[PDB]
């Protein structure tokens, strides 16, 4: 309150949030940014000049909250600021740009917060030599700051391989955030790999921007690249591996996804098959060439207790060599209790993380800062949707009213048994069948998700359609996916939590949900990703669909409004469908008579 | 609705009173400005000539394209009885009212007027510092008191009784409080010119034995007076009227001399947009308004989060919408506020969205919508949540000796529209409490 600041009669409605004490600049009509002097929130006008010039600067320094059609909303925090400085940015540049783009003068509170979050970047650097990690520094003065540190223990000192996760986290608190850069141009000890992108490739604009933020200064930066599902993160990793020209290892959270890496990898670049090896439960042979590629999964690299005699040799092969590049697909699972060990065991000069969603329920999301690096680039979902790179989706949330017969038992039963009770309500069966028939007549490929295995099998058998879940062998699920892609007879397939992410189905154009995890917002975004890469995503008037069948007046509605809190932030709008037109005229519907409904109630309650 | 509302009332007043209302030229000069442009043209043609002109001559003046406007102009002029039609020798002669004719002639030619426009004391006061502040504070108090926002100085009993008597600001002694009504929201959305005329019309309707002609001679004369000058004091009835109007912020009179204010002149005629807001699919609000009024009205159905000098940002939530519906505000009005106060960007994008859907087919698949459909659906869906359970007060009828009796009593209730539910199998039916007495009386007979 740097003035008399007579409060307005309505100032009471704003509890300590009234920011009218500051005045507006004469050039307000041009400057697009409003800055909250207390909470750090930033409001951006996407319909005014200099909006594009700020849509990228704000992303670098601030993590988005919500980016709807017109008015964007960012927020400045310590985590976001750490990312900007790590790539290389001084407080002067941020202050100059923020002041130049702010309708109102930047308050001292925000200036202090940004100034306080300043680091002496580049003083400490972690290097790898013959599988030995040395914390080298460019000046001797740092030794008095590190060697005398309580936790620890042109100058460097040794550190244990496993203890890297301690020093890096400690380095975050002693004001020296270490940087993991790689001089692959000047690195001759590691055997180089000669792979380049073939001429047929065409790197999209956003892909180049994502790579520029990593190789901007010429040294491979270790960080995370965030792009919408289906944006081409696989090609981003391929390009990063192709330009680095060194042995690379890839970790993906499935066996199907591991295979699709190899197929796409052999396609987009010139890496011959002789130099590629896949390490999964089926086959474990390793490349004998001097420098090659290994594509595997966390489950095959993170296991510690018992390893098979055939797989123990592979782990030694992975650990023994000093790899030059590691790509972590779906990096939202690396900060788990055990998966993070893949960052300390497998030595790698540069670590890249690729994920569409960078959120999770617990607070371990920030652990990525000291594990693989900061967030380099993030792309708006709507920006790529309007440019034709990813298909548009008309999301919907169908309200299926639970019948009285089933609802009467929904109250008495316990919580652990309620889930199975409101997932198999007869009305949901009718809705799912009607939608599938309508879209099949529309010449669409449909995907149905269900976190509950019992519901998945029951739905599959009733409709006589294939299903995939945990117990399905790799060969069977791969065959099912290929058939669903190329076979005309197989129009739709039922998936489960296994295919919730990292499966490429370019022919998919419609998605339906009958079950879902408790409250995970990440799963909803990942499921929607299956259809964002539709082949016919550019023909006029095309609109993919995403249905969420829920039970009216049930605990599922509580989660449904909470399970779509991330998509709403990106700009997707969820509408409520209370009725399906032309649904009664369908000849036959499941559980249409009371006799069948009562039989289902007795059948499901038996398991309960 | 400004000229329609004032004109409509004048059509209800008996012609015997309209003739007396035209005696004061001050009133005629104001009544002359409310008529359509064609009516003023014809009236100015007939005022200066003391002769009768046939209706056919007037028809010749208007062109074929403007023929439609001629029908409305004559209809409005004849309804007010300003134009007296008489037929002689098969000719529909048209003449002007002698009282209205003389009044206009004196006003334009500056003849005897009997101080219809008042007098001047030649003691002017500063208008920006006092008149603007006085009316603005007085008008703010009534507006804020209407919006429900807390405010120390509550309006006097005169206007307060007017509000309660009218549909504005429904109050109940048993509840001990006041809240806005369905019409109250519409009143708040009306411009200053309409926001003032509605109150005056209610006052003019509530007036019981000042004199009706005196009230109009003062209201219209107030518009004749120019702001920022003194005027000596007038009729006995008008004296209390002047004091009563002092509570509405239209006139300033300290402790022998009264001064009109901006609102007094605003009564006669009129005088990015302030109030335009953007609504996203995230249920957020960003209003480009800087005023205690536009912010206060938004708080009726919005959860404000922070304020800036140039804009205010809020969020639509279930609690806020429920808070608005509990006061009686219909969702149809909320969407109207969001539609009539939409930012140009929303309209441009909607037009582009419609444009991408216009050339495709003649149907266009949709009409133009400024704001996303999902906001409308959620707001309407929440309203349904309030009407989830419907309860009626009444009595249940059962234990009927004969089926004919059950049908007779039940059918009678249906005829008078007091039947809410019936069942032939159980010979039971339920009727509203309102119709209970009638049904019982019919049962005995």
């Amino acid at each position: 309150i740097p003035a008399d600041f007579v409060p307005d009669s309505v100032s009471g409605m704003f509890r300590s949030h009234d920011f009218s004490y500051l005045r507006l600049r004469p050039d307000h009509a041009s400057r697009p940014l409003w800055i909250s002097p207390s909470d750090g929130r930033i409001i951006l006008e996407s319909f005014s000049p200099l909006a594009e010039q700020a849509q990228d600067f704000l992303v670098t320094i601030a993590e988005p909250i919500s980016r709807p059609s017109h008015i964007h909303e960012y927020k400045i925090t310590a985590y976001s600021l750490y990312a900007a400085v790590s790539v290389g940015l001084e407080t002067d540049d941020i202050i100059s740009v923020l002041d130049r783009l702010s309708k109102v003068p930047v308050a001292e509170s925000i200036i202090n917060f940004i100034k306080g979050a300043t680091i002496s970047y580049g003083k400490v650097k972690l290097v790898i030599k013959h599988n030995r990690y040395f914390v080298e520094t460019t000046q001797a003065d740092i030794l008095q700051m590190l060697l005398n540190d309580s936790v620890i223990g042109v100058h460097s000192f040794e550190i244990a391989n496993e203890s890297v996760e301690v020093v890096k986290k400690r380095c975050q608190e002693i004001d020296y955030p270490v940087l993991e850069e790689y001089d692959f141009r000047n690195d001759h000890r590691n055997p180089d790999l000669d792979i380049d992108l073939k001429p047929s490739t065409q790197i999209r604009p956003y892909q180049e921007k994502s790579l520029s933020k990593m190789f901007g200064n010429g040294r491979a930066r270790s960080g995370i690249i965030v792009l919408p599902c289906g944006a081409g993160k696989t090609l981003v990793g391929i390009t990063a591996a192709c330009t680095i020209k060194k042995s690379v290892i890839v970790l993906c959270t499935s066996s199907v996804s591991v295979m699709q890496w190899r197929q796409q990898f052999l396609q987009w670049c010139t890496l011959q098959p002789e130099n590629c090896a896949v390490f999964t439960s089926d086959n474990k042979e390793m490349f004998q060439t001097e420098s090659g590629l290994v594509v595997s999964t966390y489950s095959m690299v993170a296991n510690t207790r018992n390893r098979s005699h055939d797989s123990q040799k592979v782990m030694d092969f992975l650990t023994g060599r000093e790899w030059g590049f590691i790509i972590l697909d779906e990096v939202h699972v690396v900060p788990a209790a055990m998966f993070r060990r893949v960052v300390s065991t497998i030595a790698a000069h540069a670590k890249l993380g690729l994920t569409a969603t960078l959120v999770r329920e617990d607070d371990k999301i920030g652990d990525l800062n000291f594990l693989i690096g900061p967030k380099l680039y993030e792309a708006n979902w709507m920006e790529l949707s309007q440019k034709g790179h990813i298909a548009n989706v008309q999301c919907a949330e169908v309200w299926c009213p639970m019948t009285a017969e089933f609802y009467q038992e929904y109250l008495r039963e316990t919580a652990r048994k309620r889930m199975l009770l409101y997932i198999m309500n007869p009305t949901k069966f009718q809705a799912c069948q009607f939608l599938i028939q309508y879209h099949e007549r529309r010449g669409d490929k449909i995907i149905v998700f269900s976190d509950n295995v019992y519901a998945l099998q029951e739905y599959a058998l009733k409709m006589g359609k294939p299903f995939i879940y945990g117990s399905t062998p790799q060969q069977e699920r791969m065959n099912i996916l290929q058939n669903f892609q190329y076979n005309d007879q197989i129009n739709t397939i039922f998936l489960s939590k296994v295919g919730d992410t990292s499966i490429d189905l370019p022919e998919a154009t419609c998605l339906i949900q009958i079950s879902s995890h408790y409250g995970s917002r990440r799963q909803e975004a990942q499921r929607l990703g299956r259809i964002l890469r539709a082949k016919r995503r550019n023909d006029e008037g095309f609109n993919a669909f995403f249905y969420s069948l829920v039970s009216k007046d049930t605990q599922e509605m509580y989660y449904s409004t909470k399970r779509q809190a991330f998509l709403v932030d990106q700009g997707y709008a969820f509408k409520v469908i209370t009725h399906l037109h032309g649904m009664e005229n369908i000849p036959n519907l499941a559980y249409a008579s009371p006799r069948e409904r009562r039989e289902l109630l007795q059948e499901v309650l038996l398991k309960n | 609705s400004l000229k329609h509302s004032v004109t409509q009332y004048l059509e209800e007043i008996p012609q015997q009173v309209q003739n007396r209302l035209y005696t004061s030229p001050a009133t005629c000069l104001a009544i002359y400005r409310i008529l359509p442009p064609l009516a003023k043209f014809f009236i100015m043609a007939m005022v200066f000539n003391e002769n009768e002109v046939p209706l056919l001559d007037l028809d010749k003046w208007v062109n074929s394209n403007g023929k439609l406007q001629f029908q409305n102009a004559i209809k409005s002029m004849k309804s007010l009885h300003l134009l007296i039609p008489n037929k002689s020798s098969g000719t529909l002669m048209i003449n002007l009212n002698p009282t209205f004719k003389i009044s206009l002639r004196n006003a334009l030619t500056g003849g005897e007027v009997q101080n219809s426009f008042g007098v001047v004391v030649e003691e002017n006061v500063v208008s920006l510092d006092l008149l603007d502040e006085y009316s603005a504070n007085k008008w703010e108090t009534i507006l804020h008191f209407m919006v429900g926002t807390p405010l120390a100085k509550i309006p006097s009993e005169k206007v307060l009784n007017l509000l309660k008597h009218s549909k504005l600001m429904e109050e109940v002694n048993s509840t001990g409080e006041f809240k806005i009504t369905n019409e109250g929201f519409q009143f708040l959305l009306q411009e200053i010119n309409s926001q003032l005329w509605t109150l005056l019309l209610q006052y003019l309707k509530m007036i019981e034995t000042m004199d009706l002609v005196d009230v109009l001679h003062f209201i219209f004369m107030l518009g004749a007076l120019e702001v920022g000058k003194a005027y000596k004091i007038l009729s006995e009835t008008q004296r209390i009227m002047l004091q009563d109007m002092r509570d509405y912020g239209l006139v300033f009179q300290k402790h022998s001399i009264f001064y009109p204010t901006k609102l007094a002149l605003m009564l006669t005629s009129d005088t990015i947009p302030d109030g335009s807001l953007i609504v996203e699919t995230n249920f957020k609000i960003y209003s480009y308004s800087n005023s205690p009024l536009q912010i206060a009205v938004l708080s009726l159905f919005v959860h404000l989060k922070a304020r800036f000098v140039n804009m205010v940002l809020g969020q639509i939530t279930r609690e806020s919408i429920r808070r608005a519906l509990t006061n009686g505000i219909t969702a149809d009005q909320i969407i109207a506020y969001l539609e009539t106060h939409a930012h140009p960007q929303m309209r441009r994008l909607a037009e582009e969205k419609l444009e991408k859907k216009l050339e495709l087919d003649p149907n266009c698949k949709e009409p133009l919508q400024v704001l996303p459909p999902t906001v409308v659906d959620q707001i309407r869906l929440w309203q349904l949540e309030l009407d989830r359970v419907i309860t009626y007060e009444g009595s249940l009828y059962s234990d009927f000796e004969t089926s004919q009796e059950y049908n007779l009593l039940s059918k009678y209730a249906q005829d008078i529209g007091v039947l809410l539910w019936k069942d032939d199998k159980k010979k039971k039916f339920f009727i509203s409490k309102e119709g209970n007495s009638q049904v019982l009386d019919f049962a005995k007979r």
Binding site: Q430, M583, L589 | -
Partner: peptide
């Protein structure tokens, strides 16, 4: 936008 229609059942 279908909000006033009957229940989705059947």
């Amino acid at each position: 936008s279908t909000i006033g229609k009957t229940a989705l059942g059947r």
